[PDB]
Structures are given as C-alpha cells and as structure tokens.
Design a protein around this ligand. Sequence first.
Ligand code: HEM
Ligand code: HEM
Ligand code: HEM
Ligand code: HEM
Ligand SMILES: C[C@H](O)[C@H](O)[C@H]1CNc2nc(N)[nH]c(=O)c2N1
Ligand SMILES: C[C@H](O)[C@H](O)[C@H]1CNc2nc(N)[nH]c(=O)c2N1
Ligand SMILES: C[C@H](O)[C@H](O)[C@H]1CNc2nc(N)[nH]c(=O)c2N1
Ligand SMILES: C[C@H](O)[C@H](O)[C@H]1CNc2nc(N)[nH]c(=O)c2N1
Ligand SMILES: NC(=[NH2+])NCCC[C@H](N)C(=O)O
Ligand SMILES: NC(=[NH2+])NCCC[C@H](N)C(=O)O
Ligand SMILES: NC(=[NH2+])NCCC[C@H](N)C(=O)O
Ligand SMILES: NC(=[NH2+])NCCC[C@H](N)C(=O)O
Ligand SMILES: [Zn+2]
Ligand SMILES: [Zn+2]
Lengths: 411, 420, 411, 420
Amino acid sequence: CPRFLKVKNWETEVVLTDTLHLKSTLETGCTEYICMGSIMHPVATKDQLFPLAKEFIDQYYSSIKRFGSKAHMERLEEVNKEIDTTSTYQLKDTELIYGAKHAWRNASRCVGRIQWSKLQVFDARDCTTAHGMFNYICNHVKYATNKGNLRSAITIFPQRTDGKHDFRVWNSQLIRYAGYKQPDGSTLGDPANVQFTEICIQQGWKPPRGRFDVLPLLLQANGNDPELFQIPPELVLEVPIRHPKFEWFKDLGLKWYGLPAVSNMLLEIGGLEFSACPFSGWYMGTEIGVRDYCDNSRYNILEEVAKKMNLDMRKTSSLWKDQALVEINIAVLYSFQSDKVTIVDHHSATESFIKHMENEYRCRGGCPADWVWIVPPMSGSITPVFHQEMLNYRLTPSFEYQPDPWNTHVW
Amino acid sequence: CPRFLKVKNWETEVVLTDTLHLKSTLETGCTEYICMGSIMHPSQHARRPEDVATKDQLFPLAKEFIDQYYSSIKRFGSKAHMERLEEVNKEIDTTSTYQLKDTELIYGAKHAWRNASRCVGRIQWSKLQVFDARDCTTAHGMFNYICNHVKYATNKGNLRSAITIFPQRTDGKHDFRVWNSQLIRYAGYKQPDGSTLGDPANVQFTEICIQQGWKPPRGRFDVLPLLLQANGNDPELFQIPPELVLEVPIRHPKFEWFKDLGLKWYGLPAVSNMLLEIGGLEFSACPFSGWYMGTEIGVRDYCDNSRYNILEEVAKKMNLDMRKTSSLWKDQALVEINIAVLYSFQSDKVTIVDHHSATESFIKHMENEYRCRGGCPADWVWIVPPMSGSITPVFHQEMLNYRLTPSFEYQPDPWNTHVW
Amino acid sequence: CPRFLKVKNWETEVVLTDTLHLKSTLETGCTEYICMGSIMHPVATKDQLFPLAKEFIDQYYSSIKRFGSKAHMERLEEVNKEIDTTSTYQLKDTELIYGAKHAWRNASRCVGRIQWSKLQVFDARDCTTAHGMFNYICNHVKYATNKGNLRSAITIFPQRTDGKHDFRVWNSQLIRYAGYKQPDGSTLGDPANVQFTEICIQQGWKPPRGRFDVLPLLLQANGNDPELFQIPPELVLEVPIRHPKFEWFKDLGLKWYGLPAVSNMLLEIGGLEFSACPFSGWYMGTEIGVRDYCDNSRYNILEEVAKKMNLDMRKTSSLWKDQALVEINIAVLYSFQSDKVTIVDHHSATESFIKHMENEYRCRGGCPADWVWIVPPMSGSITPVFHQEMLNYRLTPSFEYQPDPWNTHVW
Amino acid sequence: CPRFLKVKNWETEVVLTDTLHLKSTLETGCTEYICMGSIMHPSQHARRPEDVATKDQLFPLAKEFIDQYYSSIKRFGSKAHMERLEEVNKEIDTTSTYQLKDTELIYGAKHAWRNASRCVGRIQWSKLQVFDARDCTTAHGMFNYICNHVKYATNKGNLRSAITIFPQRTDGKHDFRVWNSQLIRYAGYKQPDGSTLGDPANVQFTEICIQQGWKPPRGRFDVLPLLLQANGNDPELFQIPPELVLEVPIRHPKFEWFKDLGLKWYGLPAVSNMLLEIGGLEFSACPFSGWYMGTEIGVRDYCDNSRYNILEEVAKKMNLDMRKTSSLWKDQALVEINIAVLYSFQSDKVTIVDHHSATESFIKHMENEYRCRGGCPADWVWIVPPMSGSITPVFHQEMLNYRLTPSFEYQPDPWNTHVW
Ligand code: HEM
Ligand code: HEM
Ligand code: HEM
Ligand code: HEM
Ligand SMILES: C[C@H](O)[C@H](O)[C@H]1CNc2nc(N)[nH]c(=O)c2N1
Ligand SMILES: C[C@H](O)[C@H](O)[C@H]1CNc2nc(N)[nH]c(=O)c2N1
Ligand SMILES: C[C@H](O)[C@H](O)[C@H]1CNc2nc(N)[nH]c(=O)c2N1
Ligand SMILES: C[C@H](O)[C@H](O)[C@H]1CNc2nc(N)[nH]c(=O)c2N1
Ligand SMILES: NC(=[NH2+])NCCC[C@H](N)C(=O)O
Ligand SMILES: NC(=[NH2+])NCCC[C@H](N)C(=O)O
Ligand SMILES: NC(=[NH2+])NCCC[C@H](N)C(=O)O
Ligand SMILES: NC(=[NH2+])NCCC[C@H](N)C(=O)O
Ligand SMILES: [Zn+2]
Ligand SMILES: [Zn+2]
C-alpha cells in the first residue's frame, strides 16, 4: 500500500522493484510533508513482547523452510509460556545466530553487507561480571584481528531485564584513541573521545597524554558501576601510515588501529534488547583517510599535509584540500596493504555493495539502504552507489542507537 | 502534529530551529515508514501533468500566494490586499484562471528560486533579472526572447542570473515549451560503432532535431539548435547565433598536454525544461540561468560513465598505474580535471564558483534563512557536491527537505505528450 | 508499512490481523488529513499495460500453485509479445473466470461475498452486434432467474480497445422501472430512472406511462449508437407485495422484480477494461423495502403506508416512520418467500458476511470492506457488522464506476 | 495538494463546498491506500499519552490557538493579539507551559464541541455553560465541583449543556482524572453462571470500586460512585447524593406490561474520561454533558448484545414468532423499545431528542457551518443513528471527516497507567 516501489539506477537505466518494504513495522522519522533523510538520529511489557516474539519466531521458522511445522508451533507455545511466566524469554542459540546476522543484513547504513552471513557470533549470555566481559572482549579481539587477516565477529552479552541490570560497554568502539582538551582550547589526540577520556581519568586511568593513546575498556555488568581494564597491548594491531611516493609522509607520525569494533549500539531481536553487543568487521579506507584524519573536528590534518606537499593554499579554487585528501587516502590503503591488514577502498566496497543490492532484490525483494551514509565521503559520483536510487526503511532484527551510558547511570 | 524541529551541524555544534516547515502544503514523497530521499522524481500525489487546474484547485492556491505576497510587503489585511483577492477570485470565477501583476510575477520567480531545495546557489536568490515574456505568441517570438536572455545573462563572461517567463498554461492544448533541456547543450550521436559521440544525455533530443531537418555537424561538441513550441504548435528549429554562445577551451595550469584532449564547455548553464508554479498558475516555459559550480562540469558532465566519461583518457595522459582500484587513480584524475575546469574558466574571466566556496556560502545563507525566515528547505543528497563530500561543510550539516510554493517542478518531456 | 493492521469487534472483543492490505496498489481517496469514507464516488499505453498484465498473471499462477513454472514463464512471454505487437492482450478463459470471481471477492461494498466463488461466467467476448448483446443478455436473465431459484452470474462483453469501440449497456441494471416527470413536478414510476427513460423515449420507445413499466434495453456494441430491445416479458420475473397480517397492503399495488442485475459497472482485470459486464445475484430485502420503496427520492411510500396503519403522524417522536419501515420490510421478505423467489434478510446476510470475513482473514489475511455500504440501511446496530471494525482498500481485479455513456457518446 | 472539496446530498442534490478542511493539522488515521473510517481509535501518530508537550511542541500549538482566538473576535494583528502572543511565549520559554485566560478557556471548550466530528448535537455548540475548575486541588474539591455540575445541568429535567474543567496536565505526574467513564453510570457484576448482572460495560470499573471499599448493592441499576483522582494521587471514592441523580422508569404508551420489565435509565449523559486539548494544553479531567438522543439508550444501551441485551425478552412479551430471522422480530421489538424510551422521558419532562429531529437539526447545522465557516467535520459512521439509518437525512449526506483543534480526544483508562 503501495505494493510495489521502483528504484532506478541513473547510469545503467536498470529499474528494480522493491516489495521488501512491506515487511516494515517501525517508523523512519519522515512524514508525507517532510524528509528527515539527513538527520543523524531522527522496558517491554508482556503485552508488547508477545507480538514481537511471535513475529520473530515466525520469520525464523519461515527462513529455515519449516513454517507451520510442529517444531514451529511448539517453540511458539514455549516462548509464550516463558513470557507469561517470567515476562520475558530466551532465544535458542540458533535464533541468536540468525537474529545477529539479520540485524547486520538489515543495517541500512552499512556498505559492507555483502558479507552479512559470514559472521562469527560469540554467545556471552552467561556473562555475569565486568572481568568476565573483559575476557570475552579479549577473545573477540584476538579472533577478529587474526594477525591482520580480519574476520567479522559480534559478542553478545545478557539481554536487558528490568533496565536496572543492563550490561554496557561504555567505549563507543573497543579500540579508540584518547582525546584531551588543552589549556588553549585545542585538543590533543582524538576530539571525538574527549568526554569518554575524562570519565576514564576520573575513574583512575593514568593517561599517557599523547596523540594515539589506546583507551582502556570501561565495562558495566548487570547494571553495576563500570570497571576499567587495559586491553593487553599485544592484542591491539596498529598500522603506521606511510605514502608510496612521499618519503616525508611517515614523518607526520600518523597511525591507526586495524580493528573497527562498534561497541555502543543496541541489538534488538524479537523484542529482546541486547544493550551490549560489540561487533567488528574491517575498514573501508575513507573512514580513516577522509573522516578520522580530515574532519575539522577529528585529527584535522589537511593543512599539515598540504604544506608538506608544497601546495598553494591561498585560494580555495586551487583544490589544494582535494589534492591532499587523495594523497592521504592513497597512503592509508597502501599502509594497510603493505602490512597485510584487511582494508577495502571505496570503489571496490561500493561496487560490491551494488552486486549485493542486486542479489538482495532478486532473493529478498529489496535492500533497505541509506544513501546519505552509503555514498563515500569523497569522490561520491565516481562510485556506482551515487547513481543508484535507494529506499530506506527499518526491518527487525536491527542495530539501534542508545543513549550514552553516563547520561543514565547512577553510581 | 505540528512541532518546531532542530537541525544540528556536527562539526560546529550549531543547532537551528526550523519553524518554516509548518507552512508546507505539498508532499515530499516519503512516508512514516519509507524514506525516498534518494529518489530523483518521487511520486508526490501531484495531479496529472496533462490536466489543468480546476476552480476548486485554483481558489486556495491563489489565495495562499496572494496572502503570502501581501504579507511579504507588510500589507496583510490591507484594503489593497482585500481588493486584489476579490479581483483574483472574480477572474477565477468567470474565466477559471487569473493573471499575475508584474510585481507578483517577479516575487513569484524569486521565491521559487528561494524555495528550490536542490539549489546550493540560493544566497543569490533575490538578485534575479526577470524577463516577462507573457505577451509572446510565436516560436520566432520565443527565439527573440531567448536570444535576449542569452545575451543579458552571458554579459561577456560576467554572468548575471536571469529568468524568462513565457505564457502560462491555459487549457493544456496551447502550452509554450522549450523542448531543449538547457538553452545551450551539446549534441549526442549513436555511432555505427555502438559507441556514442558527443553528449550521451542528449541523444534522443538530437535525433528529434535531425528528424526535424537539422543538419548535424557530427562532432563531439556541437551546440544544439533551439526547438521551440509556442501556443501548443509543433515546435520549430532555430540556431542560436554563434557569437552569443560563450565557450571555454579546457586547459590545465601545470599539464601542458591537457589542452590536447580538445575539451571545452559552455559558460551559461540555462535549465529550460522545468515548470514554474506561482499561485496555482503554471509556467511551462521558464528558462533560468545563473553560473556554474565547477563540479557540475568537471565531475558530472565530464566524469559520469554515462556522460563524456573522460577518466581513463586523463589517467593515461597522467601516466597513472590503473591496474588496481586501491591506487585511487580515478580520484587523482578527478581532482586534476576539476582543477583544469576552474582554471580555464577563471583565465577566460567567465564566472565560476568552486565547490568549497559555494557550499561555505550556502551554510551562511542557511543561517540567514533560519534567522529571517524560520528555516531553509534543503535536499542534502543534491546539495553535497559530487566529489570531496566531507571536506565541504554541508556534508556535516543536517537539513530538512520540504516543499514550499512558488516552486520549480519537473514536467514530462514534451515529445512524450505532443501529438503532431 | 505498517505490515500489520488490527481490527476489533466491539461486541465479541475479537481482534483480527490484516496483512492483505499490503497487496493494495490503487488509491482510496483518503489522505492522512482527511477521510472520504462517506463520499459515494471519491486507454492504457503499452508501458502502463506490461506491469498490470504481469501482476495479474503472477497472481493467477500463484493461485493455482504453479508460480515459477513452466506454463507461468511461457504465459508471461506470450502476454508480453502480445502487448508488444498489438498494444493489448487476450485473457485465457481460465484467467477471465478467475478475474471475474476475484473482482467480486474484492468488492468492498458487497455484503454478499460469502458466495464469491459460486459465480457463473458467460464469456461474451465473441460478441459484435447489439442484437448479439441482446441474445447474451436474454441468456443471462433466463439462467440467473431460474424460475425464482436465482443463480449468480456475469456476462462479459469485449474489452475496450482504442476507447472509440466500447461495448456498453446503457441501463444501470438489466431490469428497472421507468420514471416520468409530470407537469406539476412530481414523478410517476421510479425517479432514479427519469433521465434514462427520456433517452429511451427519445430513441422512439413507446412508453406505457405506468408506475412499474419495465424499461427496454439500450445497448451499444463496438462504440456504435445504442439500440433498443424489449426483454421478452416471460423472462422478467416479478413479485406482487403483500403483508402477512395487513390484508390491505396488497391494495397499495406494489411490486418489484426478482433479479437485481447491475449493468453499468466496469470490470478491470490485469489492466484490461471490460466496460460492459452485467452481473447479478439476488436481493437483500432492505434494498427494496428500505431504499427503493422508502427513499424520499425513490417510491417514497412511507406516508401512505403509515396512513393505512393509522399511526399518529403528528410527531416525529412517535416513531411512526420506523414502525411503517419495519412493516414494509416484513412484506417484501414475506412476498418473495411466498413466491419462492430467492431473497435474504439483513440479519442473515450480515451474519453470513461476518462468517465470510473471518474465513477471509484466516485464508487470505484480510477482507476489504466499506462499513458505510455494508451496514444495512435500517436497524444498523442490531446486525453484527455495525460492531465490526473494517479496513477499506482497493484490490485488483475489481469492479469500478464509469461515466454514464450519454455524457461521452458522440451520436 | 490543497483543494476545495464538494459534498453532495443524494436526496436533496444540495452540493456544499468545503474550504475548512484546509485548516486541519492533525491526522485522521487513513492513508491514500487504506481507509480507517470505521476504526474506533485509529492510530494517528500522536505523541505518547504519558509524555508531556515539549517547548517545541507547545510554541506552534499555542500560536495557532491564540491566532484563531483573536481572529474570531475580529482582532487579528492588533496590539492585544501581539501582546497576548508575547505573554504566552514568555511563559512557555520560562516554565515550558502557559495559562489560558478565562475567555480563551471558554472559547476553547465551545470550539472543541463545535469541532467534535462524532457529535450530532452540535447545533447547540455555543450554548454551553463552562465551569472553570482550574483552582481545584483535592479529590473532595473535585466532588464538590462535580455535584455543582450535575445539579446545574439536570435542572430538574430541563437539561442544560455544561462542562467542568479541572487543572491541566503539568509534568504528567500530577494529572486530574475522573476514573468514571460517565459521571452517572450503572454497575455491572460478573455472575457465577457467566452472565452479567447490570451493565457489562462497567464490570472492570465496578471491580475497582469494590476493591477500593465500595459496598455494592448488587442490583441491575446501581448508580456507581465517583472515583476521583486529584493532583496525581490515588483516586478517592465519593457517592453522588441520590437526590441529584434524576432517573426515568421506562413504560410504553400502549403495552401495559412494559413497566413490568423494571427498566430505567438516568437523565444526564455526562462523558467524563475524555481529554480536552486547547492550544497544546491538556485538560485530562473535563466532564461534559448535554442530553440524550433516544437511540443511545433504546438501541445501544438496551439492545446491544454486550449491554442490557433486552431484545428477546421484549419480543417474548410482545408474543412475536422468534423462530426465523426474516420475520424481523428483532426490528419490531427495537422500534417499540425506542418508542418507550421517548415516551417515558417526555412524560417525566426530562429533555430528550428523537433521532429524526436530531439528524434534521444536524443537517441544518452543517448547512449553517458551511455558510459561515466553510465546512463542518463529520464522521458519518457515528452520525448516522444505530436504527432506521436511511429514513434519516444524514444517511444520504456526504460528510468529510477531519480533525480541527481545540478538540476532545480519547486518553488511556487511568488504571492502565496509574502507579499506587
Ligand atoms: C566486514 C566489513 C564491513 C565493512 C567494510 C563495513 C562498512 C561499513 C561502513 C563504511 C560503515 C559506515 C561507518 C561510518 O561512517 O561511521 C558501516 C556502518 C555500519 N555497519 Fe558496517 N561494515 C562491515 C561489517 C559490519 C558488521 C560485521 C556489522 C555488524 C554485525 C556492521 C553493521 C554496521 C552498522 C550497524 C552500521 C551503522 C553504524 C552507525 O550508525 O554508526 N557492519 N559499515
Ligand atoms: C547563481 C548561481 C547558481 C549556482 C552556483 C547554482 C547552483 C546549483 C547547482 C550546483 C545545482 C545542482 C545542478 C545539478 O546537479 O544538475 C542547482 C540546482 C538548481 N538550481 Fe541553482 N544555482 C544558481 C542559480 C540558480 C538560479 C538563477 C535558479 C533559478 C532561478 C536556480 C534554481 C535551481 C533549481 C530549480 C535547481 C534544481 C534543478 C533540478 O532539479 O534538476 N539556481 N543549482
Ligand atoms: C449473491 C447474492 C448477493 C448479495 C446478497 C449481494 C449483496 C449486495 C448488496 C446488498 C449490495 C449493496 C447494493 C446497493 O446499496 O445498491 C451489494 C453491492 C455490490 N455487490 Fe453484491 N451481492 C450479491 C452478489 C453479487 C455479485 C454476483 C456481484 C458481482 C459478481 C456483486 C458485486 C457487488 C458490487 C460491485 C457491489 C457494489 C455496487 C455499487 O457500488 O453500486 N455482488 N451487494
Ligand atoms: C445538546 C445535547 C447533545 C446531544 C443530543 C448530543 C448527541 C451526541 C450523540 C448521540 C453522540 C454519540 C454518542 C455515542 O454513540 O456514544 C455524541 C457524541 C459526542 N458529543 Fe455530543 N451531544 C450533545 C452535547 C454535547 C456536548 C455538550 C459536548 C461537549 C461539550 C459534546 C461532545 C460530544 C463528543 C466529544 C462526542 C464523541 C464522544 C465519544 O467519542 O465517545 N456533545 N453526541
Ligand atoms: C548531517 C549528515 O547526515 C551527517 O554528516 C552524515 C552524512 N553521511 C555520513 N555517512 C557516513 N557513512 N557516516 C557518517 O558519519 C555520515 N555523517
Ligand atoms: C540516485 C541519486 O538520487 C541521484 O544520482 C542524484 C544524487 N545527487 C545528485 N546531486 C545533484 N546535485 N545532481 C544530481 O544529478 C544528483 N543525482
Ligand atoms: C452519503 C452516503 O455515502 C450514501 O448515502 C451511501 C450510504 N451507504 C450506502 N450503502 C449502500 N449499501 N448503498 C448505498 O447506496 C449507500 N448510500
Ligand atoms: C466498529 C464501529 O466503528 C463501531 O461499532 C461504531 C459504529 N458507529 C457508532 N456510532 C455511534 N454514534 N456510536 C458508536 O459507539 C458507534 N460504534
Ligand atoms: N568498517 C566498519 N565496521 N566500521 C565501523 C565504524 C568505524 C568508524 N567509521 C571509524 O572510522 O572508526
Ligand atoms: N549552476 C546551475 N544553474 N546549474 C543548472 C544545471 C547545470 C547542469 N548540472 C550542467 O552541468 O550542465
Ligand atoms: N443484491 C444485489 N446484487 N444488488 C445490486 C443492487 C440492487 C439495487 N440496490 C436495487 O435496489 O435494485
Ligand atoms: N448525548 C450525549 N451527550 N451522549 C454522550 C454519550 C452517552 C452514551 N451514548 C450513553 O448512551 O450513555
Ligand atoms: Zn525521507
Ligand atoms: Zn478514510
């Protein structure tokens, strides 16, 4: 209603038909009179949980081609008695694996979804303490890093109960660099992490006060006050950034970590909420080269690089920023590759994503996709995704945003 | 339910409050469940293009526009307001259409620009020369008006914004249409090769011209003739006098070989296929022009695979290693082409703006608009330039897209409608 | 989007879930800001036809559980080549029958749809003249009347081609009574048929000028001027109306016809348009007893029945109209039953409809229904449909309104 | 796209033009693809019931209301309009709420009635007594105010329309609520045999009253106590003084046995569980009353299968042959019950309107409203009486349903939300 929606690719003229949108139950934020497409961010009762669980179990049994089976019916009744009796329920291991992979399949902001079914799921639902969380995270980091040959993984901690016993990873990613405000108002290190760094120091962390200090983990188990743990340094793979032609590039002393491991999202499956679910894949180069290094509110290196390149910086129309941007991005890829650390460039990644989108239309009837996030932050129209119409809608299971845990926790 | 909305800039932390969206009366194409922000022409439950406005459609649309006009000149509820409303109503009542005052037409055109959510150039919105061509009756008359537009707008390279507005739709059988999609564009030809010579965007229009008896030079940059439909008649061909057509040969400030590619482009971007809607009145022929942002030429026109597709050519001449995507050879060539376009336009003293300067001005305009008007409708997908997105400030700026009227709207290609 | 909608019955508290709304492709007339639920009325190119034909053939092949065959793929190719070469296509007999039955299944205004699959389809696509049409119409009337034991039926004339060659039955129903404007402004016979009656007279029909004159058929074949034909009187089954207790009722000289045969609708199947498609079932009593007899702008008999009942008519609050209404409706049912002519009362009809709706939710995931038309025009809340929430949406194949032919027709 | 819409009456052929729907700012629940005209509580994308308006929600809602109010007293744009708007804005920015003037509250209440698309009684809309109870602070104070209401409105059978308006919502933790669905209603009791004694609609509410300590007489027509929530505290029980409760024993003008059924009803329909929204302010306790239309009692209260369900018992005493549905025995009994209700109220001099008189007046009202206001929102599903539909003129009248504010809205039963 409408049944069929069409997307066009403006380079190939290929028109595709979406019916997967019909499975949407959650709202996007837009209305018929306003589009919120560029806005970054536009305790279940028994009664609410029943339908959400049924819908999930239903789709699970359908996916394994056993819809209507007595297994299907019995699982439904078991779940139903479980909710009725404890006001919640437990996923079977198979359901949790399915839910996690599908939350990734459904993530409309992820260009990496061709890999969605190749995902190692660590089931940490028996975890009870922050030291326990630390151990699981270390196994995840070791497994995922794999000496540079990165492998996708998610570690899933106990689901929410009453909301007073939440497991949380206070870090926004498992591995990030510290940020300190300087007396003159500038920032040393990564300005994105200034608040989180302050919390860590406040909690007792001794800060080395350099540019690329790996943050410790701040871990909350069962709603208890969070605890600090240092990731053993031999587990954190880093790459020093050099350039294949500019010998001076290494002199900038840039580096970055190999494993991008988002750790502050909420994974929702059949109405159940996994507030601690760090997951990791591998980098697309522009995430580091364009955003991390060249955002004005991040490491902000364009000007230094341009100076070393001896560019004429007096006029914006010389495109000195653009020129430097490319060199930086060349260096990031070249450095990761030289060190045998899995990375993908924005051309290869977006081309793969288009193939994935086409497979998804053919087998699933569509592929929810957020064009604003999917198109890379540089060279947008010389990647195929710029020219591809897309439709954005929300399927469950899904990854969602949740408030920072310091905004809620009582000590 | 009505509410004020906040937009945040994620670099500056500046948060702005949108109140203007509350005035929107036209649909965006999204729903609560499905966002259609990246669809180029979403369905927006508009009435069929071939239909003309009924009285019941016209009355509210004319009242809303006249109210907004009298409100804008600080004369809302005045005797003149009331009398103008009465006159407009009698006209709709007795003829089922009305005529705009010249002042209203000028106001309408500037506001349609002010309201164009896809336009990054709107800081310039009130500086618009409006050529009122509503007395035009023939295709030759149209030609004359268009030659004036081209001459005034071009201004020997010192480009000036302008719009020329032909007679409004009546019964839908006497429409004025400029068949060209822009006043000045290059021909495209399907070759015996299978390849395309010239601009592939213009292949169908080119065949129509040829079929109308136009003699194609069959080169890579043939300026297209005008094909102009007056009063609903079959369209007629006219060659723009070549001396009115300002072109720029493309060269690079450092690469002496770049000029050997034999690239050029025209100075005057003049969109000619859109419909201007003011108070329910439809101006189906309303060519308008400003000046280029360099990426329009250097990224899209030159580097789209379905356009001139010059990336490989240029990368070869640059002696780049093209074996792997990860060398970013495409991105290197792209920066150089875009340098050359800006340099070539600046050297010939033809107005151009680069994507950094254009987007920085847009941010400034947005802020002025939130302060003086309560918002600025903007389509992020179109506003963020097609290269270097996040090293421009608009990438980091949340925008809200909504449709205000007066507006510029798309309309079907006339060869899809026209019976000969 | 949303995938699930709920309807509640406010007498039983049963909640049903609708998913059939998802197959909707056509608009209703409402918007998010206005409801047009009580508004009575709120040629296809090659490019339009391809998708409409595909959607239909797909749903047909899915209905016979052969989706993705073999026969399905070839039928699609055949249809596509047909549209390609001729800008139109022909339905198989199978698909025509299926389409006709589904148009009835989908008609949200019809309370009689429990019967939807028991429909006799007379395929009149080989018809070419008005006399041909007359013949097919005589067949339909005779078969559907069946001496009082009415059988549902539809006769389908050739589809529209260029729009200049339309088949049309100018009558709104095959059997209806003439109406005559009188010099003093009153009307003799049925006021609803005055315009059509004048046309007939203008075409040289010699009018009896009584209260219940059965109209001639006015039939347009192949876009030609329409022609007059008298329905052989022996084919026209009528019922004199008398009352089981009031011996004086028969003296009112009332009668009606047995066969309600709507003849002015358009049947749309897979993008094809059948502009002449008379169809019939049998009456619900209130149609005659409440609407045809008691509408102020119909036979308007309330006051004279009330007079004969000797009711105090001086105050609305005596409910003299309501009493008369019930008595007239009793007489209609009693008369049809006494003469063994199929009829259904509004309790039995609406009860069957709720049972049908429940069947449709179980097997099809919903049942579009227009509450405004489904609730009988008397005694609303003492039928179960009044208490039943319904969703209205438009499914194809469908029956649609079309303009009176005498507005368009060039003589 | 905005347009004027036409509604036709299919008996009288009168066509009216609706312009008022263009003012609507709240959703109906339908979409372009799915009509929800018969859903009792469609979801309309309202904010969560248990949230309170933010500044960003309140600023435009308050401006819209104050504009309509000053426009109504022909004072739009005046100094007073501007200064009132200024004062409201300071209050919102400073306390994130505001207070209505007495005149604004009275205007708001009357227009909420005028705007109630499901009410057939709106010809009466401007004749409404407003009891301003915004100074109330206790459950006992609520009781006193409600006693005042019942006494004023009943007026010894000569019923007068009234509303009593308790303090608006603040943080949502201090809500005033009448837990009763109407001020006067009959208890219902589930019986060991599975039947219900008294009124099944009130079983759950009755259960709560007994749990709270009310001693149930356990009969068929027990007048329920008030359960009153002040300032978000647990609610308190209060019996209405029985001399304030006017009741009518039902007898028939021809059937001597009718009185033997021991039926009665109360004179005063006082809906007490709705929320009154004025300018984004929320009056969660606002009991209002007019007088009955006969069918509300005769058809629904007495003949719904899930209410008193009296049909078969009446038909038996009428000696009807109940073996077949097509004898229309149910329809005959229905009419007689309805005659009895009207006759009884009229004999006792208690205001009542029959459904012919009520709907004929409503048609007149719609016509007045179209003439003076440009429309009348109306929900046909609710307006058409539950018996004899098409022998009332509203059945034949096309209606447009849309939502204007101020308005009366549904809110959740407080026992689903309340923390003890
Ligand atoms: C395996 C290689 C992968 C690649 C190359 C990749 C690529 C990306 C990129 C480039 C983004 C945008 C990042 C940003 O701008 O902040 C993204 C977002 C995202 N990806 Fe992936 N992805 C991968 C794997 C995964 C995995 C394993 C998951 C989860 C199981 C995942 C879920 C997400 C989600 C939820 C987002 C949105 C995050 C947000 O809103 O901040 N992706 N992906
Ligand atoms: C003065 C210099 C101007 C600049 C630098 C500018 C910039 C731009 C750019 C870059 C686009 C996107 C073009 C594309 O991707 O195809 C655009 C679109 C547009 N601009 Fe401008 N603009 C200017 C003047 C104008 C004028 C004079 C008008 C009309 C009065 C106008 C109305 C529009 C409209 C309606 C669009 C959307 C076109 C579409 O949908 O395809 N702009 N503008
Ligand atoms: C079998 C016995 C049937 C019964 C008892 C029945 C009942 C009804 C009734 C009472 C109406 C409302 C009529 C009015 O107010 O004018 C109606 C409408 C309708 N029915 Fe039936 N129906 C029957 C068979 C059929 C058949 C055979 C078809 C077509 C195959 C059909 C399609 C329709 C349509 C399209 C409408 C709406 C017509 C309009 O908008 O004017 N029904 N039905
Ligand atoms: C003058 C006497 C009045 C009459 C005869 C009358 C008539 C009616 C009727 C028959 C209903 C349908 C009730 C139902 O089916 O449950 C109704 C609904 C309504 N009326 Fe009135 N009305 C009157 C006065 C009022 C007053 C004084 C107000 C408020 C100030 C009001 C506001 C409403 C509202 C909001 C509804 C919808 C209630 C709901 O959704 O349950 N009416 N009216
Ligand atoms: C305002 C805008 O939505 C915001 O800058 C977005 C744009 N697109 C993005 N795309 C990706 N992949 N990641 C981001 O952080 C952003 N930021
Ligand atoms: C699919 C997508 O909407 C389409 O390619 C858009 C993207 N953004 C654009 N932005 C501008 N300015 N111009 C365009 O033509 C486009 N094309
Ligand atoms: C205005 C209103 O929609 C119109 O009177 C409708 C109401 N319901 C109906 N219901 C049926 N079945 N038939 C009708 O003709 C009508 N008329
Ligand atoms: C399902 C349906 O909407 C519901 O039964 C409505 C129908 N019309 C009504 N009409 C009025 N006046 N009052 C009601 O309670 C109802 N109930
Ligand atoms: N490829 C991924 N899995 N990315 C997740 C986000 C990493 C983030 N963009 C960063 O630069 O650190
Ligand atoms: N700056 C403008 N006014 N542009 C209008 C569109 C021009 C178009 N993008 C082109 O490259 O030809
Ligand atoms: N039951 C049917 N098939 N009805 C078709 C409509 C008949 C119409 N209502 C009449 O009174 O004549
Ligand atoms: N006329 C009114 N004010 N009605 C309000 C609703 C009364 C309700 N219908 C009842 O029967 O008790
Ligand atoms: Zn959107
Ligand atoms: Zn609706």
